[PDB]
Amino acid sequence: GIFGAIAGFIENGWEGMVDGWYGFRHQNSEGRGQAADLKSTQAAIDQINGKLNRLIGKTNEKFHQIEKEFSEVEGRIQDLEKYVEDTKIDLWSYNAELLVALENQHTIDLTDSEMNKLFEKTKKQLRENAEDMGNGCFKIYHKCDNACIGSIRNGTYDHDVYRDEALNNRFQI
Amino acid sequence: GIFGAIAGFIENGWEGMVDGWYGFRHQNSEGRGQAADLKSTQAAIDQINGKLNRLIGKTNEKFHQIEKEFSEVEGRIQDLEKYVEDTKIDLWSYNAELLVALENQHTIDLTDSEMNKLFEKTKKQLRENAEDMGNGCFKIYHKCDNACIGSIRNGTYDHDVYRDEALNNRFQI
Amino acid sequence: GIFGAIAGFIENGWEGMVDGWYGFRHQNSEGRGQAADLKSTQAAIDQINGKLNRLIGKTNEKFHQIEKEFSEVEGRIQDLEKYVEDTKIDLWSYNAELLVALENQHTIDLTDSEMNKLFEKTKKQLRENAEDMGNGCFKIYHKCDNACIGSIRNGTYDHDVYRDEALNNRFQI
Amino acid sequence: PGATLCLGHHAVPNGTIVKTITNDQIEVTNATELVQNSSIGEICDSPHQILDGENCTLIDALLGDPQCDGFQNKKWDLFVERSKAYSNCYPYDVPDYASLRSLVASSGTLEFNNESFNWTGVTQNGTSSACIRRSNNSFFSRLNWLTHLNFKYPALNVTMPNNEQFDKLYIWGVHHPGTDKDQIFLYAQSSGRITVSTKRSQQAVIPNIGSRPRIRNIPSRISIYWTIVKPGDILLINSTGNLIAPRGYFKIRSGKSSIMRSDAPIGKCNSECITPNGSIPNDKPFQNVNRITYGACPRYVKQSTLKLATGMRNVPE
Amino acid sequence: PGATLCLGHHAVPNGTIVKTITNDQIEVTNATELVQNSSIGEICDSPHQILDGENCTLIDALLGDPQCDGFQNKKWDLFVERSKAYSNCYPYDVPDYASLRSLVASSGTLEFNNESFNWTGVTQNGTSSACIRRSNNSFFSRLNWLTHLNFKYPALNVTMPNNEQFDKLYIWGVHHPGTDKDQIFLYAQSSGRITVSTKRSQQAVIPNIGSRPRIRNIPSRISIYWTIVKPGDILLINSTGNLIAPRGYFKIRSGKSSIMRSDAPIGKCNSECITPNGSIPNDKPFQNVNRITYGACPRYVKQSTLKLATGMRNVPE
Amino acid sequence: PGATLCLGHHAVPNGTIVKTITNDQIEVTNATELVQNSSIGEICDSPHQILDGENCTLIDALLGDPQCDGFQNKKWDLFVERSKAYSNCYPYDVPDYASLRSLVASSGTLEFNNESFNWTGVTQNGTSSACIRRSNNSFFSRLNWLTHLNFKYPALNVTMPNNEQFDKLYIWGVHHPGTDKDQIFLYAQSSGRITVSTKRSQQAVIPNIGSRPRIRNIPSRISIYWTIVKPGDILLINSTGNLIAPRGYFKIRSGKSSIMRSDAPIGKCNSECITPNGSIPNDKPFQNVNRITYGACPRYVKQSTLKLATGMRNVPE
Ligand SMILES: *[C@@H]1O[C@H](CO)[C@@H](O[C@@H]2O[C@H](CO)[C@@H](O[C@@H]3O[C@H](CO)[C@@H](O)[C@H](O)[C@@H]3O)[C@H](O)[C@H]2NC(C)=O)[C@H](O)[C@H]1NC(C)=O
Ligand SMILES: *[C@@H]1O[C@H](CO)[C@@H](O[C@@H]2O[C@H](CO)[C@@H](O[C@@H]3O[C@H](CO)[C@@H](O)[C@H](O)[C@@H]3O)[C@H](O)[C@H]2NC(C)=O)[C@H](O)[C@H]1NC(C)=O
Ligand SMILES: *[C@@H]1O[C@H](CO)[C@@H](O[C@@H]2O[C@H](CO)[C@@H](O[C@@H]3O[C@H](CO)[C@@H](O)[C@H](O)[C@@H]3O)[C@H](O)[C@H]2NC(C)=O)[C@H](O)[C@H]1NC(C)=O
Ligand SMILES: *[C@@H]1O[C@H](CO)[C@@H](O[C@@H]2O[C@H](CO)[C@@H](O)[C@H](O)[C@H]2NC(C)=O)[C@H](O)[C@H]1NC(C)=O
Ligand SMILES: *[C@@H]1O[C@H](CO)[C@@H](O[C@@H]2O[C@H](CO)[C@@H](O)[C@H](O)[C@H]2NC(C)=O)[C@H](O)[C@H]1NC(C)=O
Ligand SMILES: *[C@@H]1O[C@H](CO)[C@@H](O[C@@H]2O[C@H](CO)[C@@H](O)[C@H](O)[C@H]2NC(C)=O)[C@H](O)[C@H]1NC(C)=O
Ligand SMILES: *[C@@H]1O[C@H](CO)[C@@H](O)[C@H](O)[C@H]1NC(C)=O
Ligand SMILES: *[C@@H]1O[C@H](CO)[C@@H](O)[C@H](O)[C@H]1NC(C)=O
Ligand SMILES: *[C@@H]1O[C@H](CO)[C@@H](O)[C@H](O)[C@H]1NC(C)=O
Ligand SMILES: *[C@@H]1O[C@H](CO)[C@@H](O)[C@H](O)[C@H]1NC(C)=O
Ligand SMILES: *[C@@H]1O[C@H](CO)[C@@H](O)[C@H](O)[C@H]1NC(C)=O
Ligand SMILES: *[C@@H]1O[C@H](CO)[C@@H](O)[C@H](O)[C@H]1NC(C)=O
Ligand SMILES: *[C@@H]1O[C@H](CO)[C@@H](O)[C@H](O)[C@H]1NC(C)=O
Ligand SMILES: *[C@@H]1O[C@H](CO)[C@@H](O)[C@H](O)[C@H]1NC(C)=O
Ligand SMILES: *[C@@H]1O[C@H](CO)[C@@H](O)[C@H](O)[C@H]1NC(C)=O
Ligand SMILES: *[C@@H]1O[C@H](CO)[C@@H](O)[C@H](O)[C@H]1NC(C)=O
Ligand SMILES: *[C@@H]1O[C@H](CO)[C@@H](O)[C@H](O)[C@H]1NC(C)=O
Ligand SMILES: *[C@@H]1O[C@H](CO)[C@@H](O)[C@H](O)[C@H]1NC(C)=O
């Protein structure tokens, strides 16, 4: 939420992208296609797995404790045993509630962040050859076939190769 | 703070904007004016109300507990009753202190975020027709009367209509 | 991490920058050089010192409490004294663990933020006279001697002075 | 020509300072207080059932001190004990007083059922000038002071089965006369002895003859004991003197009842959260009014104020 | 012509609702449950050493109620007491029963070492029809009922030094006969008295003759006491009647042992975390199965569910 | 031509690994330790008032064991009890020893005021070879061993009003002789009895004659009791033998005092936080030195180290 990509300038997600969490859809003279981006996907997954590693399979051993159920009325000492336990449980229940709310806000934000980083990286790569359409899409102002699109996805696109063509198209009248 | 708009590249707030939290000021050939942006304002308010919903009107019922004031010296059991209560109060006081510090940092950041999102949205909308002056303002390189400014605020501005005019003005010598 | 500058689009840090946390390296017709940016450095330091002020030198006084070691087996009351203390220690150990994990994530993010803010500020300052090379560097499309570079660092660069020269170089064929 | 379009945010002339993770004083446009710091100074009589002890402690209302006769069989969610309270019957003590007070407080009722114990052989209904009811010598309403009959006190062996489906709470006592002369005058023998048993318990008490510092001119004492009897179990009382006999049992319940020490007046008003200082609003999550509370209450903390930002950073012109 | 390149993220048709700091219901692509809410309903016999008390409470196994003879000298990590348990020996009580139960539970062993006390002058091995072992009148296995010998009960003054390098736990008792007739018949004198001392302690008990409500037709009682003797210290027993003598000592250890009340069957399975409802998986950090636990367990909380997002916000087409 | 301007951040060749929400090992440029893990091994004598018990426990200094005479009337913030401590007076026990120790520790003073009790009829100042002071038979300094006078011990009925504006703490005891011969020799009658009462309390004790395992050749014992007397109240002592009489009262205060068991030497230094291991610096918020602390101390946690990042992520060349 905090970067404003997911549920933001990206109108919605793609249910048909089943091999990654972030990716690219293109249209060019050869067709229209989709490819997952592995690095952004892995970055988000690794961070979420980091949270899980802290929370799952990490329990604490306790042995003999105090009694917590009572068959006879006793007064002062039993009042204290009950109060100690009730106090403990409320503090742990608070910790658990807060942990989940904080972690979840952060998970939504970090996943939004990874979407934003990939968008920004792509934008810089394209230099003067494309314009940001405001919805996560770039209009690319030159012929850009499948190999060309692939070079952008693979981070090997050479903006200089297309710059003359793109500037001519962009700054036309 | 973390996005760097509020108390950042936006020099200061506007005390004269009383009908929203974020908005637009313009100058054009017809005058100078101000309009609140409702969507960004509501987004910030809704998130803060979300925090309030978690904190306000949500108290826990407790009934018979332990005694917490004592008229006679007793030793061991009373030491334990006092220590249990002191321990509880310090843990709750810690939770309360941390909650406020964390929430407040986050509220400052989310409000900064909403300012930044509205700025970014506007920037993209203007495409090649305006330049970022670095202080939250755009220099718009074409005649842009009240209806024109209104179209930008309302998200219906058609950059193509003005592009020839703007490029001629921008890339002049 | 969340802005994607440090350990992100900035490939690595500079061990040779020993007079600040953020800064500028340039190359021009007079040589190549480095200068720390004081304001961004101070902003990061001040925030970290804010955390330290909350944590260091702020301990709580406690006096007579309960016993916590025992030389004889006693049963019920001693079980309760031990359980109260064990409960307390686990809750404080949890608070300490969480505090460090949360603060550290946030410290990494705020320092990433300050790097990003300085990059964005510089980018806006340069207007149409430079292009973002995607790795934290700007290609500046005009002669920019030491005084010129210094004006950018000092926030006094006048983009209008160089604009004709830069546009001619940028939009060449 | 062209135009300029500037993005911005509001500010106020009257911002509020809050604390954050990185700064102890940062001004925001608005905030709200999370610590309730005041009471209206009265304990609202709604929505919890309040019982004002007035001059009577719960234990005095239990035993049946004459000035507490109005309390018979009453119930409460919160029994309020006043600092002005005082006893005006036969002087007594209760070993583990705090526990009897607590269990009765938590049970939340003074409902009492009389039972017909067989006290053949002794004189019942002993009275004292230290315990006046309606201008006459009297005694605790719920207790039966047994004395010799015709200068004999035969060994009592009295039984009372619990054939109910609920538990019974029995309150009884042992009299410690101030002199041997008194012991003989009351019980017709030099040494009394009391054993109260069930199938799962036994309480044996030896009277202690001797002077204590006089209370309202009385050097003797009564020590109060209690016994809970489950369904299917049986109360057995064995005494050869000095027994202060129960007249029946109290019902013992479970639920949300308690007791609080406070001198705040009871008001005709409605408030969920009670403290000894008075009722407090419960909208805020925390409070620094009192660590003692009853009902749906904010949690007690040490801070006098905690301000939650409800607006952005305030950056005035 | 040219091309379009759009950046995007996945979505699912079946998102899950989670809570955050700013919204109580936001849909994400996936989440995982952090509260364990179920048990398989059996207490797995591994990896902790389980001892099923069956018909015997720990105290009955300690004293040596005949039906608990199978428990002699056994050890446990977790002793499991069943609600069906019952005593079938001489009726007894234990002042501070909860403490004796706890210290024995925590010690985790019933290892018993016999010792040769010098009971010259009295008759040993008293038996009762209220405590049948192998169809004959018997008694607690670990206790020695002493009675008169030739109508005399000489004052006992018996010593037992701890010359070991470990502590000794002694269990002993006082008999309260139901009548004077019984007192005389057993102990040949009207009043018994018991003092058990060490260098650092003394426990003096006066027998209380009198009828209690009959248990399995028995109006008398035995009260059970315990004494710990350190190395270099000495057990001293002084009695003139009514002593229920120890036959030796229990070893007392320290470690991870405990006791739990549960009616869940023991299963042949392996689970680290035990609750009275049965063993529970311990992968999740929290659980709402029971506040009573033993082993490496999730922490008990009040919530029935807490969903941790494991995916981004879900924004369907 | 033109120019290049690159933005960047520093790095160090010696980064430190910290934990975060999403990664258990990430390197930053600098960090600081939040867990204090060491002590200098001495308890600094400043700024709290330290009283080193040396050979004396607090209770021995209270009663007035001869080797503890130097402690008379002293005050402390922290009384330090040494493991080497030992008693060298008449052997005694204190029922609820831990409570007497605690209340005296918390009061923080041994200030004692003598009072002139009326012991007409008996012999005062009884001494013992088990309690040597200045090479002569003596007794606890604060206690008065009463014995027969001319082979009579008349029933004592002695009063002492508290007409002060502060509470009085009385320490007294009961002597348990080892034989009937001793009982008669000391008290001139077979059975003693002690009742100590106020308006709001009564403590009745029956002496127990009999041998205990000898301590420093002594088979008898004294049991120590205490009584607090409020202003307007009165101490009443009734005895027919075996009374170990108080000589006056201790003042009882409230404040920040305590007691700690430690063998760490006292040093001439200044440190706010004390643990049994020695004083520890209190700059860090947490510590793993000891769960036992006194003063302004870091909070005890289980972790041995918690590193707080004080720099950005370290990304070396
Ligand atoms: C043991 O000593 C106590 C303390 O002296 C004796 O108690 C005192 O007994 C006297 C004489 O009966 C009481 O005097 C009365 O005082 C009241 C009220 O002030 C007055 O109205 C009467 O006219 C009478 O003078 C006195 O109150 C009482 N003092 C206390 C503290 O209780 C006690 O009698 C002695 N025990 C024996 C068995 O002798
Ligand atoms: C004091 O009172 C109690 C209560 O009445 C007396 O105990 C009762 O004694 C009778 C007569 O021995 C017992 O009767 C027996 O009952 C059993 C089982 O129901 C039956 O099998 C025998 O044939 C016999 O009838 C009765 O159980 C018993 N009641 C209780 C509650 O224990 C007690 O004897 C009296 N004490 C003295 C010293 O007289
Ligand atoms: C009941 O039994 C105990 C234990 O046997 C008796 O106590 C013992 O009494 C003897 C004889 O007086 C003590 O002997 C003395 O030992 C000391 C130190 O070792 C020595 O210096 C003397 O010369 C003398 O021999 C022995 O210490 C003592 N043992 C214990 C454990 O206290 C006790 O006397 C018996 N009670 C009665 C009333 O007979
Ligand atoms: C509670 O006890 C006080 C004190 O005895 C009672 O106040 C007395 O009331 C009578 C009748 O009005 C006056 O004559 C006395 O002067 C009062 N005594 C004092 C010392 O103030 C009060 O009535 C009792 N309250 C109830 C409701 O029983
Ligand atoms: C635990 O006690 C119960 C109750 O006495 C025992 O169950 C009895 O078993 C015998 C033999 O099969 C039956 O004849 C009885 O009918 C049962 N009694 C009842 C009331 O069910 C059981 O055997 C005991 N368990 C162990 C292992 O000793
Ligand atoms: C504390 O007690 C010990 C043990 O009695 C005392 O140490 C003795 O000191 C004397 C005099 O120097 C020596 O002759 C003994 O050999 C010591 N005994 C032992 C066993 O070491 C010590 O003096 C006492 N401390 C104080 C200050 O009273
Ligand atoms: C600021 O002042 C106005 C006018 O009195 C007031 O209504 C408003 O609540 C104030 N803001 C706060 C909450 O500080
Ligand atoms: C300040 O915030 C609180 C809580 O959101 C709100 O009730 C109040 O109206 C606010 N004041 C203003 C002037 O917005
Ligand atoms: C005892 O007093 C009560 C209460 O006034 C009365 O009802 C009862 O008749 C009296 N019993 C006897 C035997 O005097
Ligand atoms: C409530 O009463 C307590 C106890 O007397 C006192 O400490 C506190 O100041 C009171 N608080 C308020 C807000 O009246
Ligand atoms: C969504 O549905 C699929 C198909 O049944 C299932 O495999 C997947 O786990 C579901 N996602 C979740 C975890 O809700
Ligand atoms: C949902 O998340 C959990 C934890 O990461 C994982 O085990 C499970 O496979 C996830 N489901 C899907 C469909 O990704
Ligand atoms: C007492 O009974 C035990 C257990 O059967 C037996 O071993 C021992 O010989 C008996 N002792 C005497 C003196 O009868
Ligand atoms: C476990 O048993 C407790 C106590 O009887 C009961 O409250 C709870 O419902 C049970 N929980 C489960 C998951 O079976
Ligand atoms: C890194 O090394 C230098 C030189 O020894 C040292 O001064 C500095 O403190 C080190 N950084 C840290 C704190 O690890
Ligand atoms: C590491 O951080 C701490 C706390 O800010 C500081 O005292 C120390 O000087 C730092 N070291 C360096 C080399 O910056
Ligand atoms: C008792 O001993 C004390 C302390 O030495 C002394 O002052 C006092 O005179 C003695 N009293 C009597 C009556 O012997
Ligand atoms: C302090 O003493 C305790 C208790 O003996 C011991 O466990 C611990 O190791 C000591 N800690 C330090 C840092 O000396």
Q: Which of F222, F229, F231, F224 is nearest to F249 (CA)?
A: F229
User: What contacts E27, CB < 8 A, 6 or more positions away?
Assistant: E15, E16, E17, E18, E313, E314
Residues in chain B within 8 Å Cβ distance of D260: none
How far apart (Å, rounded) are the C-alpha atoms in residues B1 and C165? Answer: 36
D275, β-bridge pairs: D278
Asked if the Cβ–Cβ distance from B97 to D35 is below 8 Å, we say no
E30 Cα nearest atom in ligand 11: 13
Instruction: Tell me if residue D21 falls in helix, strand or coil.
Output: coil
CB-nearest to E234 from F176, F213, F221 is F213
Q: Which helix (H) or strand (E) holds C66?
A: none
E260, β-bridge pairs: E80
Question: Is the peptide bond preceding residue F47 cis, with omega within 30 degrees of 0?
Answer: yes
Ligand 1 center from residue F156 Cα (angstroms):
15
Q: What is the 3-state secondary structure (H, E, C) of chain B?
A: CCCCCECCCECCCECCCCCCCEEEEEEECCEEEEEECHHHHHHHHHHHHHHHHHHCCCCEEECCCCCCCCCCCCCHHHHHHHHHHHHHHHHHHHHHHHHHHHHHHHHHHHHHHHHHHHHHHHHHHHCCCEEECCCCEEEECCCCCHHHHHHHHCCCCCHHHHHHHHHHHHCCC
User: Which residue's structure tokens are 């446990």?
Assistant: E76
Best of E181, E209, E211 to mutate for ligand 2, by most ligand atoms within 8 A of CB?
E211
CATH class of F49-264: alpha beta
Asked if the Cβ–Cβ distance from F302 to C68 is below 8 Å, we say no
**In chain C, where are the structural domains located?**
1-173
Asked if residue F45 lies in contact with residue C173, where contact means CB atoms within 8 angstroms, the answer is: no
F171, β-bridge pairs: F226
D12 Cα nearest atom in ligand 8: 13
Asked if the Cβ–Cβ distance from A64 to E9 is below 8 Å, we say no
Ligand 5 center from residue E86 Cα (angstroms):
11
Asked if residue F145 lies in contact with residue F139, where contact means CB atoms within 8 angstroms, the answer is: yes
Phi, psi of D19 (to 5 degrees): -105, 150
Phi, psi of A116 (to 5 degrees): -60, -40
Residues in chain C within 8 Å Cβ distance of A164: 173
Asked if residue B112 lies in contact with residue B5, where contact means CB atoms within 8 angstroms, the answer is: yes
CATH no., domain C1-173 = 3.90.20.10
Asked if residue E243 lies in contact with residue E237, where contact means CB atoms within 8 angstroms, the answer is: yes
Question: Is the peptide bond preceding residue D47 cis, with omega within 30 degrees of 0?
Answer: yes
**CB count in 10 Å sphere of residue B29:** 11
Resolution, Å (one decimal): 1.8
HSE-CB of E272 using CA atoms within 13 angstroms: 14
How far apart (Å, rounded) are the C-alpha atoms in residues D180 and D219? Answer: 13
Instruction: Tell me if residue D169 falls in helix, strand or coil.
Output: strand
Q: What DSSP character marks residue C30?
A: T
For every residue of chain F, DSSP letters joined together read --EEEEEEEB--SS-EEE--SS-S-EEES-EEE-EE----SSEEEESS-EEE-TT--HHHHHHT-GGGGGGTT-B-SEEEE-TT----SS-EE-TTHHHHHHHHHHHTB--EEE-----TTSB----EEEEEETTEEE--TTEEE-B-BTTB-PPEEEEEE--SSS-EEEEEEEEE-SSHHHHHHHHSSS---EEEE-SS-EEEE----S----BTTB--EEEEEEEEE-TT-EEEEEESS-EEEE-EEEE---SS-EEEE--PPEEEEE-SEEETTEEE--SSSEE-S-S--BEEEPEE-S-S--EEE-SPBP---
Asked if residue B115 lies in contact with residue B3, where contact means CB atoms within 8 angstroms, the answer is: yes
How far apart (Å, rounded) are the C-alpha atoms in residues E264 and A151? Answer: 64
Q: In sequence order, which ranges of A8-140 are alpha helices (DSSP H)?
A: 38-55, 76-126
Instruction: Tell me if residue D250 falls in helix, strand or coil.
Output: strand
Query: Which two structure tokens, joined as six digits, stand for E103?
Result: 């210290």
Kindly give the pairing relationship between strand C130-132 and strand E136-138: unpaired
Kindly give the pairing relationship between strand F286-287 and strand F35-36: parallel
Question: In angstroms, what separates the C-alpha of F295 from chain D's closest C-alpha?
Answer: 19
User: What contacts F129, CB < 8 A, 6 or more positions away?
Assistant: F137
Ligand 14 center from residue E274 Cα (angstroms):
13
How far apart (Å, rounded) are the C-alpha atoms in residues D256 and D107? Answer: 8
Asked if the Cβ–Cβ distance from C76 to E100 is below 8 Å, we say no
Instruction: Tell me if residue E181 falls in helix, strand or coil.
Output: helix
Give the CA distances from residue D118 to residues D156, D233, E178, in Å, rounded to whole numbers and listed in that order: 9, 18, 21
Which chains sit next to F, with 3 or more Cβ pairs under 8 A?
Answer: A, B, C, D, E
* Maximum pairwise Cα distance, chain B: 93
E43, β-bridge pairs: E266
Asked if the Cβ–Cβ distance from B74 to F98 is below 8 Å, we say no
* Side chain identity, residue D307: K
Q: How was this structure determined?
A: X-ray
Residue F189 burial (10 A CB sphere; 0-12, 13-18, 19+)? middle
How far apart (Å, rounded) are the C-alpha atoms in residues E279 and E277? Answer: 7
Task: Determine contact: A36 vs chain F, CB below 8 A.
Answer: no
The protein residue whose alpha carbon is closest to atom 1 in ligand 11 is E14
How far apart (Å, rounded) are the C-alpha atoms in residues A23 and A19? Answer: 9
Which ligand is in closest contact with the Cα of E145?
A: 13
Asked if residue F34 lies in contact with residue C55, where contact means CB atoms within 8 angstroms, the answer is: yes
Ligand 10 center from residue B96 Cα (angstroms):
20
Residue D265 burial (10 A CB sphere; 0-12, 13-18, 19+)? exposed
Give the CA distances from residue E23 to residues B41, B48, C72, E26, in Å, rounded to whole numbers and listed in that order: 16, 9, 53, 6
How far apart (Å, rounded) are the C-alpha atoms in residues E155 and E177? Answer: 19
Query: Residue D161: closest CA among chain E residues belongs to which residue?
Result: E213
Query: Which two structure tokens, joined as six digits, stand for D255?
Result: 């639920």
**CB count in 10 Å sphere of residue B169:** 17
Instruction: Tell me if residue D226 falls in helix, strand or coil.
Output: strand
Q: In sequence order, which ranges of chain E are alpha helices (DSSP H)?
A: 58-63, 97-107, 180-187
Query: Residue E254: closest CA among chain C residues belongs to which residue?
Result: C73
User: Which residue's structure tokens are 């200098």?
Assistant: F40
Give the CA distances from residue D243 to residues D174, D194, D240, E179, F198, in Å, rounded to whole numbers and listed in that order: 5, 6, 8, 20, 23
How far apart (Å, rounded) are the C-alpha atoms in residues D109 and D253? Answer: 7
E307, β-bridge pairs: E33
How far apart (Å, rounded) are the C-alpha atoms in residues D311 and B111? Answer: 8
Asked if residue F93 lies in contact with residue F223, where contact means CB atoms within 8 angstroms, the answer is: yes
Kindly give the pairing relationship between strand B31-36 and strand B22-28: antiparallel
Give the CA distances from residue E185 to residues C51, E136, E151, F87, in Å, rounded to whole numbers and listed in that order: 81, 21, 8, 46
Asked if residue D275 lies in contact with residue D297, where contact means CB atoms within 8 angstroms, the answer is: yes
Instruction: Tell me if residue C41 falls in helix, strand or coil.
Output: helix
Ligand 8 center from residue B35 Cα (angstroms):
21
Kindly give the pairing relationship between strand E221-229 and strand E92-93: parallel
Kindly give the pairing relationship between strand D221-229 and strand D168-176: antiparallel
Question: In angstroms, what separates the C-alpha of C42 from chain A's closest C-alpha?
Answer: 25
Best of D51, D52, D55, D56 to mutate for ligand 4, by most ligand atoms within 8 A of CB?
D55
User: What contacts D219, CB < 8 A, 6 or more positions away?
Assistant: D178, D211, D212, D213
How far apart (Å, rounded) are the C-alpha atoms in residues D60 and F312? Answer: 68
For every residue of E121-172, DSSP letters joined together read TSB----EEEEEETTEEE--TTEEE-B-BTTB-PPEEEEEE--SSS-EEEEE
How far apart (Å, rounded) are the C-alpha atoms in residues E87 and E66? Answer: 10
User: Which residue's structure tokens are 């005021």?
Assistant: F113
Which ligand is in closest contact with the Cα of E280?
A: 14
The protein residue whose alpha carbon is closest to atom 26 in ligand 4 is D55
Query: Residue E26: closest CA among chain B residues belongs to which residue?
Result: B50
* Side chain identity, residue A149: I
Asked if residue F45 lies in contact with residue F55, where contact means CB atoms within 8 angstroms, the answer is: no
Reported for E267-272, long-range contacts at CB under 8 A and 24+ positions apart, including other chains, are E267/E40, E267/E42, E267/E43, E267/E44, E267/E45, E268/E44, E268/E45, E268/E46, E269/E40, E269/E42, E269/E44, E269/E45, E269/E46, E270/E44, E270/E46, E270/E47, E271/E40, E271/E44, E271/E46, E272/A59, E272/E47, E272/E296, E272/E297
Q: In sequence order, which ranges of chain D are alpha helices (DSSP H)?
A: 58-63, 97-107, 180-187
How far apart (Å, rounded) are the C-alpha atoms in residues E183 and E176? Answer: 8
Q: Using CA of residue F93, residue F96, residue F100, residue F101, what is the dihedral sign?
A: positive
Query: Which two structure tokens, joined as six digits, stand for D186?
Result: 């009351």
Asked if residue D8 lies in contact with residue B116, where contact means CB atoms within 8 angstroms, the answer is: no
Question: Is the peptide bond preceding residue F265 cis, with omega within 30 degrees of 0?
Answer: no
HSE-CB of B74 using CA atoms within 13 angstroms: 13
Give the CA distances from residue C31 to residues C144, C145, C146, F5, in Å, rounded to whole numbers and listed in that order: 11, 9, 8, 12
How far apart (Å, rounded) are the C-alpha atoms in residues A12 and D281? Answer: 44
Q: Which helix (H) or strand (E) holds D219?
A: none
Query: Which two structure tokens, joined as six digits, stand for D202?
Result: 């036994």
Residue C92 burial (10 A CB sphere; 0-12, 13-18, 19+)? buried
Q: Which of F223, F99, F258, F93 is nearest to F169 (CA)?
A: F99
* Side chain identity, residue E288: N
Query: Which two structure tokens, joined as six digits, stand for E202?
Result: 């003394």
Q: Which of C148, D183, E22, D42 is nearest to B110 (CA)?
A: E22
Residue B96 burial (10 A CB sphere; 0-12, 13-18, 19+)? buried
User: What contacts F9, CB < 8 A, 6 or more positions away?
Assistant: C5, C6, C10, C13, C14, C17, C21, C22, C23, C111, C115, F312
Q: Using CA of residue E183, residue E188, residue E191, residue E193, what is the dihedral sign?
A: negative
Angle, to 10 degrees, between the axis of helix A76-126 and the axis of helix A38-55?
170
Q: Using CA of residue E45, residue E47, residue E48, residue E49, what is the dihedral sign?
A: positive
Asked if residue E148 lies in contact with residue E253, where contact means CB atoms within 8 angstroms, the answer is: no
Query: Which two structure tokens, joined as six digits, stand for E284?
Result: 């999740």
Asked if residue D4 lies in contact with residue B129, where contact means CB atoms within 8 angstroms, the answer is: no
Nearest-5° Cα angle at D67, D64 to D73: 45
Asked if residue F252 lies in contact with residue B73, where contact means CB atoms within 8 angstroms, the answer is: yes
Q: Which of B57, B21, B18, B27 is nearest to B39 (CA)?
A: B21
How far apart (Å, rounded) are the C-alpha atoms in residues E1 and A105? Answer: 42
